[PDB]
Design a protein around this ligand. Structure first.
Ligand SMILES: Cc1c(C(=O)C2=C(O)CCCC2=O)ccc2c1c(=O)n(CC(=O)OCCOc1ccc3ccc4cccc5ccc1c3c45)c(=O)n2C
Ligand SMILES: Cc1c(C(=O)C2=C(O)CCCC2=O)ccc2c1c(=O)n(CC(=O)OCCOc1ccc3ccc4cccc5ccc1c3c45)c(=O)n2C
Ligand SMILES: [Co+2]
Ligand SMILES: [Co+2]
Lengths: 383, 383
């Protein structure tokens, strides 16, 4: 059931913003590791004396990396005279965020019809305001409300190129890397208590619970009207045999925050080949691969969707496969993106639910918790 | 003249430590950009609940990247019970350093005969103590005194593998990258006043002034007995036509700090080919290349050292050449390593002064300030 109860018009995920200590080094690492090109900047060279912000793109996926300069460079400015291109930015907030949480996502940004309306309606319906609507160059409106922890949900609306004040990046510095990633599929938060988190966010968005179908978590998914904005939220389950990874996250993150970003690839085989080639030369590492019994067990569950060769290819790359009643999901998880065992990335591709493909086709891979356990148990027997 | 007045026995540069917000992302970027392999770690996986530290090596060059975890992970510890592998580390110091200066060098470490003696003698002779001598696993001694700004000179001495508590890195995560870099040649500081800086450092080390031979700087070089530890220091010259780059550094860095690291290559042509291939895919950018008149002018000044083809190769890679009365220097400068226009890297190779090669052979390239200006002026005429 989809009650289509959005309290304002939501379009798609627009961008994800990381708050960094040094935006240059994080952006360059991510660019090489994920195959995203440098497409826009706002920094000292564009007249921004407040923050350095670098935008990477791959298809429609937009990753923004931002760090503060010395406050001394902008000490004479006030908000009316600011040279910041992102008016919600604050030196103190950014330094406090990074000292508390380490490298991570500050903003989950969605494009809406009218960011001022979205903000007003959200706050009227319980949202905690974070940054009021601000019109940039009479062209783009941006506003922010609290989502969970120190993560904000950012609303952006366009009258009619990333943001005013950002400049397109010099062709020489813009190498056209591309490993197949095309858009943000979903963005997942970890919280201490799932119930209140869901009630809060669903309360101010009108997002509805998206239908699903000993692992240390309970989870639920909030979705927009056309179910293309997908926001799963996890809480820990305590007392388990293995300590809940959600609880480890909350401890190392100093509380709630964004757990993972799931990036859709138009060719997950090529994406994983390219990313794995680069794991040990600056890119990203992946979780340990499932045992061969997991891939033998694939024939029985998805042998009608993937050929033996395609199952062989999943095995070579360590890809996981799940299925619900409507579609099939190919997925894999990186190791944590930075020092702390907190944020990581998921690569996904979805098969089925053709209408365009409906959002969330195949689910989120919850069936892979028990299939990984069974396959791990099976391999001990097969040894 | 070399009075050989070192007040304690100094061996060679040992390592350089960067204080980071996220050590993982900086280390991975530097590894790919410079061709350094991951060789040791001290982090949560080795039992360190205090800081994440990753060591990159290329030949004898050692770059250490360190960031603090949440203090909550180690809140029950005291210094006698610490799980930090670098006992001088302090969460508050590291966060304050990074918030003040951004990404940069915290420690210039030199290997000495006896770090406890070096520390005592240094402080007896004016050095401001930063961290007292600490013996690690009865095997290595480490001590720190202030050098300039918030940069420390770190003394390390070994009874007889980086530091106790560090583990060698898994072969799979240790890709054997190598673009030819072999050791740290010199490390350069920017200060507001050169005179007092020289007097302070020369005072507590016994390092002597190393012989040299409108650009916005005055500089002098301090050197150890065998002149293999080389510490140039710059001060700005104000009122110039173009604003002094030393003054811009001090403004964006919030005061004195390390300006650049000069890395010796055993094959500067290969190093620059490999680094330039990677500039726009995660690595490092280089300063704009000199005009072709600069390379035509090379025939008259170094045509007895480099062939036409070797001069052609310098031109293709943007390499600068200088010469003193004893040797020839090939050098080139990167753009700043991070967000701020502060720290950068120099790649160098020295020709001559064969005895082994004596330290500082060919100088530091001061002659290239006027030759760059003349060549720039010449190219305007040749247009
Ligand atoms: C994050 C996620 C999702 C997910 O998207 C998601 C949402 O979108 C919304 C709803 C709720 C939700 O969760 C789905 C499935 C997942 C994961 C996920 O994060 N993870 C790795 C994980 O649990 O991290 C600890 C890792 O546990 C392990 C610890 C130690 C090992 C040692 C050896 C091993 C060998 C072989 C395989 C192993 C697997 C896991 C190992 C392990 C393995 C998985 O496995 N699934 C299958
Ligand atoms: C750092 C250094 C050393 C050095 O090691 C050193 C020590 O070890 C110890 C003693 C003192 C000392 O200094 C030696 C020589 C250097 C440098 C160095 O840092 N730099 C670049 C620099 O001054 O940074 C602003 C850049 O200025 C420019 C601004 C704008 C441009 C625009 C177009 C251009 C086109 C072509 C060439 C250009 C060159 C410089 C341009 C420029 C160029 C140089 O050039 N030399 C020649
Ligand atoms: Co997911
Ligand atoms: Co130099």
């Amino acid at each position: 059931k989809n009650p289509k109860s959005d309290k304002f018009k939501v379009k798609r995920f627009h961008h994800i913003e990381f708050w960094c200590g040094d935006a240059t080094n994080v952006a360059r690492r991510f660019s090489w590791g994920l195959g995203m090109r440098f497409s826009a900047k706002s920094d000292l060279s564009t007249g921004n004396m407040v923050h350095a912000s670098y935008l990477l793109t791959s298809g429609d996926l937009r990753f923004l990396f931002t760090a503060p300069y010395s406050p001394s460079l902008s000490a004479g400015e006030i908000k009316p005279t600011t040279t910041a291109s992102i008016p919600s930015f604050d030196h103190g907030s950014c330094r406090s965020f990074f000292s508390s949480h380490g490298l991570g996502v500050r903003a989950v940004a969605i494009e809406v019809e009218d960011a001022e309306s979205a903000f007003s309606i959200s706050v009227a319906n319980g949202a905690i305001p974070s940054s009021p609507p601000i019109v940039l160059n009479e062209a783009v409106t941006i506003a922010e409300v609290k989502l969970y922890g120190d993560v904000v949900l950012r609303y952006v609306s366009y009258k009619a190129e990333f943001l005013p004040g950002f400049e397109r990046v010099e062709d020489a510095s813009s190498f056209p890397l591309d490993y197949g990633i095309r858009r943000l599929d979903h963005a997942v938060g970890n919280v201490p208590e799932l119930g209140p988190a869901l009630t809060y966010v669903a309360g101010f968005t009108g997002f509805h619970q998206f239908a699903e179908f000993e692992s240390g978590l309970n989870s639920a998914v909030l979705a927009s009207n056309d179910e293309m904005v997908l926001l799963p939220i996890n809480e820990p389950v305590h007392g388990t045999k293995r300590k809940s990874q959600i609880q480890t996250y909350l401890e190392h993150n100093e509380g709630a925050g964004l757990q993972h970003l799931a990036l859709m690839s138009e060719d997950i085989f090529r994406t994983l080949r390219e990313m794995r080639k680069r794991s040990s030369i600056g890119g990203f590492d992946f979780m340990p691969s499932p045992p061969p019994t997991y891939y033998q067990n694939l024939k029985k569950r998805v042998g009608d969707v993937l050929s033996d060769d395609q199952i062989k290819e999943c095995e070579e790359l360590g890809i996981l496969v799940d299925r619900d009643d409507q579609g099939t999901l190919l997925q894999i998880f990186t190791k944590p993106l930075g020092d702390r065992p907190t944020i990581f990335i998921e690569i996904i591709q979805r098969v089925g639910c053709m209408m365009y493909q409906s959002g969330g086709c195949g689910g989120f891979g919850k069936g892979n918790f028990s299939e990984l356990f069974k396959s791990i148990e099976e391999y001990e027997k097969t040894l």
